[PDB]
Design a protein around this ligand. Structure first.
Ligand SMILES: [Mg+2]
Ligand SMILES: [Mg+2]
Ligand SMILES: [Mg+2]
Ligand SMILES: [Mg+2]
Ligand SMILES: [Mg+2]
Ligand SMILES: [Mg+2]
Ligand SMILES: [Mg+2]
Ligand SMILES: [Mg+2]
Ligand SMILES: [Mg+2]
Ligand SMILES: [Mg+2]
Ligand SMILES: [Mg+2]
Ligand SMILES: [Mg+2]
Ligand SMILES: [Mg+2]
Ligand SMILES: [Mg+2]
Ligand SMILES: [Mg+2]
Ligand SMILES: [Mg+2]
Ligand SMILES: [Mg+2]
Ligand SMILES: [Mg+2]
Ligand SMILES: [Mg+2]
Ligand SMILES: [Mg+2]
Ligand SMILES: [Mg+2]
Ligand SMILES: [Mg+2]
Ligand SMILES: [Mg+2]
Ligand SMILES: [Mg+2]
Ligand SMILES: [Mg+2]
Ligand SMILES: [Mg+2]
Ligand SMILES: [Mg+2]
Lengths: 262, 152, 206
RNA sequence: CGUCGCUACUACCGAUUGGAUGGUUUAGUGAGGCCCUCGGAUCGGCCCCGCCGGGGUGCCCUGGCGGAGCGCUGAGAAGACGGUCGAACUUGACUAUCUAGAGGAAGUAAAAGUCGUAACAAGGUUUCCGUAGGUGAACCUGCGGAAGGAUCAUUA
RNA sequence: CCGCCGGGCAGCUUCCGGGAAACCAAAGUCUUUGGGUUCCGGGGGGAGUAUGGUUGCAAAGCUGAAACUUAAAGGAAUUGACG
RNA sequence: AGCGUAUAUUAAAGUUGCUGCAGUUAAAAAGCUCGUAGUUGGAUCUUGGGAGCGGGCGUCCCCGCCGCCUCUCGGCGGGGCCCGAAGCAUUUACUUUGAAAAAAUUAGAGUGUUCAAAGCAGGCCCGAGCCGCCUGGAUACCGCAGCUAGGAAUAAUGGAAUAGG
RNA sequence: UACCUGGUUGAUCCUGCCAGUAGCAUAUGCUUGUCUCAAAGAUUAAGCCAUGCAUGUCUAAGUACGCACGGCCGGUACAGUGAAACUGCGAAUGGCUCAUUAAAUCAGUUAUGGUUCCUUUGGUCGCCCACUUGGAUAACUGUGGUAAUUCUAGAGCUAAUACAUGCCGACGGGCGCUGACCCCCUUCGCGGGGGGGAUGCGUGCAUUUAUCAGUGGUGACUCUAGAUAACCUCGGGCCGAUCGCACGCCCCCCGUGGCGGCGACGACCCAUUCGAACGUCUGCCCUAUCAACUUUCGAUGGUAGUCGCCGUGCCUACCAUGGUGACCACGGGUGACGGGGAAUCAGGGUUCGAUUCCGGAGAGGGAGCCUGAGAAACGGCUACCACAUCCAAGGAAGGCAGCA
RNA sequence: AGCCUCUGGCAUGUUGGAACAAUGUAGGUAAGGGAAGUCGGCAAGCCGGAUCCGUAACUUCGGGAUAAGGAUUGGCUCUAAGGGCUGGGUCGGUCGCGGCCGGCGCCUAGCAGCCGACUUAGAACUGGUGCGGACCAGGGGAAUCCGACUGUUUAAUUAAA
């Protein structure tokens, strides 16, 4: 290296803009953004690869520069502008508007929502600031800072942000008993109420999580971003609802739906 | 005596010391209000840190260093440097072929704050990963326990 | 150029590291400022980041303070005294962080002589009688007399300072980096500080 | 079995301060850049005058045309004193590697030459080790060993 | 003289069990593979040579290669057959 | 439709032997002994037992229990209630569960590529009037060290003795 | 598939080797009907190289007055396509190769509270020229050289978001300390209390230094935030107060004043993203025919410094006299760029991994350099060394380990 | 040691004056080359002092050995580094600034003042690269022969083996 690297080989490309070995050498590379390269969806992959809306890269070029696509209600012309946990992506000439919730396997859904539910949005918080003259600042996981928050918002909690305004509207501290989707690692896009977290000094903290069916995974704190007060997620969930079925079960349940389904 | 020995004046910054136009002798009874800190991870900031007349920038019990990463232990083997000792960490590196281990060691120079008195060789000592403090020395002694073996 | 790298020198044990790369723009060393005392002369430098760095090569004045009284007039730096590092930097009059320097007393004199209204050094009655009482002699009184009689006893100075003001030069020590910063900022050597450095100077000259 | 005889191939020793490349570097010398100190092709600007015109209150604000102090800040090239990294070059040192070599001595080939016949049978002199000394060659002889013997015994 | 006991030097005897075999209370407990640990061999010669290092007054001692060549050299026992 | 020789290298090599070779004679145990590192090192310390639920009046398999301490610490005018802290797991070694482990490769879910190496799609719904449905892109391993949590079988290691909790 | 067979001997049983066996890995020997996948100048020479190409860029939105062409149409500066030129980006990725390199590359792991960060995202932006002031070059026009180059001589013009400059704004209004002072109550008066004050000086987002107090945040502040005193890194802090295209409006109201959307560059505080960087712990090939190494030429440490981006013997000075070692250092070697894997394989290994994925390095070799956020950048240049081209003999241009 | 000078001594070692020929005997110096020089490097010069760096083959393990081979060296202005000597029994009492007693102190880390030889190291500055500037002052290396080494010897031709 000398400078920064403006390029990405297919293969090296993470496991979920779900790309295939043939067809190319390169993968698209998230242009820098709010979300970290490794936890993205460059718009381009929706269009040609997920929805089969376009076909190629040029087909997508011609889409976004009509100015149809609106990633959190603010219009993007970058084919490679990164989306990631908790975004919107309104199409508008269609009225579909999706999210970007990850599936139980951790691979970003094609999950459609109402025209409502494209206003409320969620965001975890990374720090309290106290900026200057005592004006306090948030830092959302999607790299918004939001000045002037309610002083009871602490770190790792979530915010029910509007969109057209920015702003905040009511919120969920990170206690026991509330609802968590997991945004990192293995137990990824898997959902459940907490139970108990294990504070450690130095090394970052572990969080035990129980789900509907009663399967306790644990995680590091920095992957848990919460989604409700307790067994009441404010957002619509993906079909499956981050329960996660053992390959054994999934296999049979998929196959058991088959034959009986007609 | 003792403290200001070297050439430049040695002082805890973030205590300005003078202001006095009142009775009760001259200065306070502590005289110099001493900057110390609690370090963290529960290790008791020892008595001689707080009591002490002394001064070393590289001590965490009386100066600017942050302890922040990997906590280890070793044994004290040589104390022939000034405000630094050498510790010796022993182990078993495993070969898989030969389904057995061999003894190894990586001795490691390490800061030793002179709050932390009555250390000797053959002395179990716990260390924190610090700022890269000198050429070799990245570690700073946090709690000497003198424990295994011999006597009070 | 004149690099700053662990890359070249021996390892702890005493083996000789081989090279690895070339020198990179990285382990970069510029030559020194070794700043003097003259009419101001500072060159900028462009550095890493973009950013810049104010390397002083001639430097006359400093923005540098009482501890106790809690002021800091901007004052001429008259002359370097000892510098603990090394004894060329004294002779050559090279200002660097923790140089001990003589400075002008005058701007510090002239706000006791506002504030508490009591003189320094000692004099017969040449400057004092026309100007101090020109600072004193009240026609407001009552509020003010109460005020810098509330500025009480403790319009007081240590003998050690009191002395120096006869001379119109104070002992102070640089706390900025003239070569990095661009200024020769500092505190006045006051109380304990002030007592080696005299005793160093005294013992040095013999 | 060994000398000895002839032929062939390896490496060895080998007079030749033998030759070649690489890596460190002792010593010197040291391109260019980089920094610092100067410099000052010049170029302005500020200004000061002469004369003239338009606007304003002899004076001022603008304009036109001339001149001169080149006053005093700015920019400012060529250049020069210093310093620092430093390729490079010159001479030593080391070590690495690689090879030139008159002539000398082994081995092997290998394998059918001569002179013996050392060993295996009690190999004609039980054999072998170590050491020593000797000898045309195996060899031989001392001393101390060894049995891997040619006696597990010698007949109170 | 007759016993026993510990630890010594040894003997015979045997389908323990070993052991290619000769043999071996131990060379026994080993494909039923590992009680602890030291040394040390990897076809034969070249060679215990060359070279290097070291010790020695020196004989020499200790450490100790390769190219090359070579198909067996060897060990235990069998009949032979010649002393 | 390939097939030959050139040589590097693996099994074959129980001919490098950790598993797992050998040392009377076959190649081979120092002449003998002392001895610092290293390796290796006897035994010995909470148990039987209790209380129950569950298999085969009692007997015989099979499970949750009797980590201790603290409460000096939180609180889910005097409180409890016990979690929050720490004595800390004597100090490890050991074991088990997490988390973290880039993809490709690998192991291997799914799939008339016509099979297969492969590929990752495809499948469907559909007479296309559906002017559209449905599912994927499974998972395991990933040494050592590092991080987390159980267990205390064995190995060290520690604590009171010119007195101390 | 856990594996064997030939060969010493008149014959036997062994040790032991030689020789077979299969795969894999590279030679080329001969042959070659179809079809699908598919490696390829790495080992020798990171040796050398002919030539051909591999890195440019325009929306409506930085300048455009080429006459280029139309327009469609002008006189009003524009209009609209538009060759050139300045400007802003990029050129810092990619591509190639592995010469070096043995705790060094690198893996995993951790740290940055010992740091920088173009861009993207989010934010945040009110102290008499602003109705924009100055000035100067390219294309362009002309006159020029040289043998020759991606060489310029020189005279006029002329742009700007290129280069400078610097104003309205805000409130003679508000708040810090100073305060010409002033009033009332109390006091014999001094004094004590209550007040109120024209006029000065300050009148900050950043900077550095000094001090003071203890909304929010950590295991971990000597942090953030707040208070006071200062300065100006000053042209070479910033904003502060920046410029285009759509051109669409409303006025208790007539022509001004308010307004609308888009962009561009700023930027300061900040966050964030790609990173980059320097640290932790633990991890490697052979070798002793290498036993001691390391140390005024920094070896290990302390103190104080300089330099940098930052902690650091990065460097200087003064002190100390250290640090490593047969758990094999130190020395030497490699047919060594490091991982991720490969073929082999009863279980265990053994060798290979220059091989597309990750990580490192180098562009004949070194060193230094500009420029740049970002490079010590080689499709830049500066010498030297090492190579090499054209020549009018004065001079000039050379870098395939981009693709061919 | 050499070389310059005071005390002390001389008056150029049995004559003078004038020139500057050849030969001489004493001294010097040479472009380029550089032993071609002779039997042979016969004479001389190179080296030369100190400080720092550095060091071979061989060995009798002492040496070799100042091996070899390098650097530096002035004047000036500094800095740094090397020592002696004396001083507290102060507070109270009492006795004559002095003593005595008793008490506290007790620098026991010393610090304070006052003296006086010398050295050594480092840094600026500085001079037409000059600096051991007068003089003192080892040329080196690779070999063979002889004689173990010190010494001695042919007074007037041999110093060696
Ligand atoms: Mg194994
Ligand atoms: Mg034999
Ligand atoms: Mg045996
Ligand atoms: Mg065995
Ligand atoms: Mg052999
Ligand atoms: Mg093999
Ligand atoms: Mg096998
Ligand atoms: Mg064997
Ligand atoms: Mg024996
Ligand atoms: Mg077979
Ligand atoms: Mg036969
Ligand atoms: Mg074979
Ligand atoms: Mg690249
Ligand atoms: Mg970051
Ligand atoms: Mg080689
Ligand atoms: Mg090349
Ligand atoms: Mg490079
Ligand atoms: Mg380069
Ligand atoms: Mg190229
Ligand atoms: Mg005479
Ligand atoms: Mg006479
Ligand atoms: Mg001559
Ligand atoms: Mg001659
Ligand atoms: Mg002579
Ligand atoms: Mg000699
Ligand atoms: Mg003699
Ligand atoms: Mg004679």
């Amino acid at each position: 290296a000398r400078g920064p690297k403006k390029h990405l080989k297919r293969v090296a490309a993470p496991k979920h803009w779900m790309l295939d070995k043939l067809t190319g050498v390169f993968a698209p590379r998230p242009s820098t953004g709010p979300h970290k390269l490794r936890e993205c969806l460059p718009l381009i992959i929706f269009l040609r690869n997920r929805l089969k809306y376009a076909l190629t890269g040029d087909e997508v070029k011609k889409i976004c520069m009509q100015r149809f696509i609106k990633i959190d209600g603010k219009v993007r012309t970058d084919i490679t502008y990164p989306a990631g946990f908790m975004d919107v992506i309104s199409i508008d000439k269609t009225g579909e508007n999706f999210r970007l919730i990850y599936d139980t396997k951790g691979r970003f859904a094609v999950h459609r929502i109402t025209p409502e539910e494209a206003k409320y949005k969620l965001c975890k918080v990374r720090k309290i600031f106290v900026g200057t003259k005592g004006i306090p600042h948030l830092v959302t996981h999607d790299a918004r800072t939001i000045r002037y928050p309610d002083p009871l918002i602490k770190v790792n909690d979530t915010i029910q942000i509007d969109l057209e305004t920015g702003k905040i509207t009511d919120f969920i501290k990170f206690d026991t008993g509330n609802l968590c989707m997991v945004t990192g690692g293995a137990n990824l896009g898997r959902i459940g109420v907490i139970t108990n977290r294990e504070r450690h000094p130095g090394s970052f903290d572990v969080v035990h999580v129980k789900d509907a069916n009663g399967n306790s995974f644990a995680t590091r704190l920095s992957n848990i971003f919460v989604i409700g007060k307790g067994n009441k997620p404010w957002i619509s969930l993906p079909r499956g609802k981050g329960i996660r079925l053992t390959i054994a079960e999934e296999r049979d349940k998929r196959l058991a739906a088959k034959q009986s389904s007609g | 005596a003792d403290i200001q020995t070297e050439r430049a004046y040695q002082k805890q910054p973030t205590i300005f010391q003078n202001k006095k136009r009142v009775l009760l002798g001259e200065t306070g009874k502590e005289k110099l209000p001493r900057y110390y800190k609690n370090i963290g991870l529960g290790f008791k900031t020892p008595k001689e840190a707080i009591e002490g007349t002394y001064i070393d920038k590289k001590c965490p019990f009386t100066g600017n260093v942050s302890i922040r990463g990997r906590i280890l232990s070793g044994v004290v083997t040589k104390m022939k440097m000034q405000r630094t000792i050498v510790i010796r960490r022993d182990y078993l590196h495993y070969i898989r072929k030969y389904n057995r281990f061999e003894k190894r060691h990586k001795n490691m120079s390490v800061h030793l704050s002179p709050c932390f008195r009555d250390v000797q060789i053959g002395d179990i000592v716990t260390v924190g990963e610090c700022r890269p403090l000198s050429k070799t020395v990245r570690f700073n002694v946090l709690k000497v326990t003198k424990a295994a073996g011999t006597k009070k | 150029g004149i690099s700053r790298d662990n890359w070249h020198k021996r390892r702890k044990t005493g083996g000789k590291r081989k090279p690895y790369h070339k020198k990179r723009k990285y382990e970069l060393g510029r030559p020194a400022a070794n700043t003097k005392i003259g009419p101001r002369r500072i060159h900028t430098v462009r550095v890493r980041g973009g950013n810049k760095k104010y390397r002083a090569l001639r430097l006359d004045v400093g923005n540098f303070s009482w501890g106790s009284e809690c002021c800091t007039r901007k004052t001429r730096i008259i002359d370097v005294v000892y510098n603990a590092s090394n004894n060329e930097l004294v002779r050559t009059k090279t200002l660097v962080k923790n140089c001990i320097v003589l400075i002008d007393s005058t701007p510090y004199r002239q706000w006791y002589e506002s504030h508490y209204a009591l003189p320094l050094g000692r004099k017969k009655g040449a400057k004092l009688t026309p100007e101090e009482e020109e600072i004193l002699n009240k026609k407001r009184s009552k509020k003010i007399q109460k005020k810098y009689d509330e500025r009480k006893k403790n319009a007081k100075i240590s003998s050690l300072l009191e002395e120096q003001f006869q001379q119109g030069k104070l002992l102070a020590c640089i706390a900025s980096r003239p070569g990095q910063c661009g200024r020769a900022d500092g505190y006045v050597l006051e109380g304990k500080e002030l007592e080696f450095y005299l005793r160093k100077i005294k013992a040095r000259k013999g």
